[PDB]
Symmetry: C3
């Protein structure tokens, strides 16, 4: 029952289900902050999440949107899904994604804003992120930069978080617990 | 000394040696179930495994073959080498490997059959699998699908298993122990 | 405060900072052994490491160079940065990098020499290496061989080391501690 929880893991590691159980532990009304991406919209099938949960779609400037919504004052907890897509959205919105500096600085501004919000938050947070740095060194410069930036974001979040879990095949290894 | 053991790890993580030590802990006669792939056969050099061990070659429908062999009634334990190649064989045998649904469902049927067999087994099992989901997101659709399917299989097996070990540089981290 | 420490992790895992803290724990004068690669030299900005630390540049035959320098008799501890670049230098110096055997044997000779030196060393060692085997199976033969060789080196070092740490998002998981 910590204030800030980071759950990270690889592809099909069960990180979403575990973070969702932590968030259900927060309470019955949960803010599911979804960072996913003219006239109409087509949507891929959404996960079957609880009925009392409210969903906040914000692909960029997550801390700003969540703070402006005021919804932190009507829920019991926050699940952020996920740091991975937030990094992806920050990269694909730069002018040159093969350049590292602007994307890195923008993602760091984003993560620092999230740390500020969570520290000042009345409800607890569980955040979902991916581990992508333990593979072969990819060749693409855009891809290497993305991997580096996500990893930096994960370091910053793990340091600010009270509990940090690393998922292997659906089961959590405790990295940090108060 | 649990009933079902899952040992997973990356490339050159020592998972095979550690699973083989667990299996040697099972007893002296071990069933080594090998899931590897016109007139003749050429073979790559096999690992030097104990003399009393019996080797069962079955690249697909592993639970069916092991059950039909009856060999669970003549050995002290089973080492399954490995879930990785079983997923690979299930993928490369579909009509279209760039399609996800058939491969996913076939691999899930395979893993569910293995869970059933192990639950009904008189001897214990140690299973070897790979962790492949902590790298950069690969581009190939066949490859992404394979990675997703292996990870799902690893979740199902870890949940059914009594002990789960994650290998780093030859040494085990305990993920789950009864 | 062990004799031989191995810190490994992925891209942007904080392994360098953590190994540097262990080394600062060794004492005030530390040998930073850097394995990085006609008339002049251009250099990328170096990390801001302590003033009393001495830096030894040796991209290949690390044990030989460190032993010949005699510097193990003027410092309080050694940080080796890093096994990853040492493997890379050993691979790129072979005639055919798509061939596995020569590179593998040369890297094993290198790691065995390092194990010998550390065992015979008056000061303790912390070594930095990368985990690269938990991603999708790469296609390139040179790349697959490199990944296999680094993983073998990490096994040998982890076995000889007294303490082994695996880094996730800047935080260490203890793999082995005396």
């Amino acid at each position: 029952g910590s204030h800030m929880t980071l759950v990270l893991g690889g592809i099909r590691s069960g990180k979403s289900q575990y973070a969702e159980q932590i968030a259900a532990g927060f309470g019955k009304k949960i803010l599911y902050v979804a960072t996913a991406e003219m006239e109409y919209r087509v949507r891929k099938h959404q996960e079957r999440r609880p009925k009392s949960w409210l969903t906040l779609e914000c692909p960029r400037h997550v801390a700003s949107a969540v703070g402006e919504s005021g919804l932190l004052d009507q829920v019991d907890g926050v699940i952020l899904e996920c740091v991975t897509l937030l990094s992806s959205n920050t990269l694909y919105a730069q002018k040159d994604p093969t350049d590292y500096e602007p994307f890195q600085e923008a993602l760091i501004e984003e993560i620092e804003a999230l740390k500020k919000l969570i520290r000042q938050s009345p409800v607890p947070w569980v955040l979902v992120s991916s581990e992508t740095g333990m593979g072969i060194s990819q060749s693409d410069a855009e891809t290497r930069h993305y991997c580096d930036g996500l990893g930096i974001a994960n370091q910053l979040l793990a340091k600010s978080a009270d509990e940090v879990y690393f998922m292997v095949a659906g089961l959590p290894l405790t990295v940090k617990k108060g």
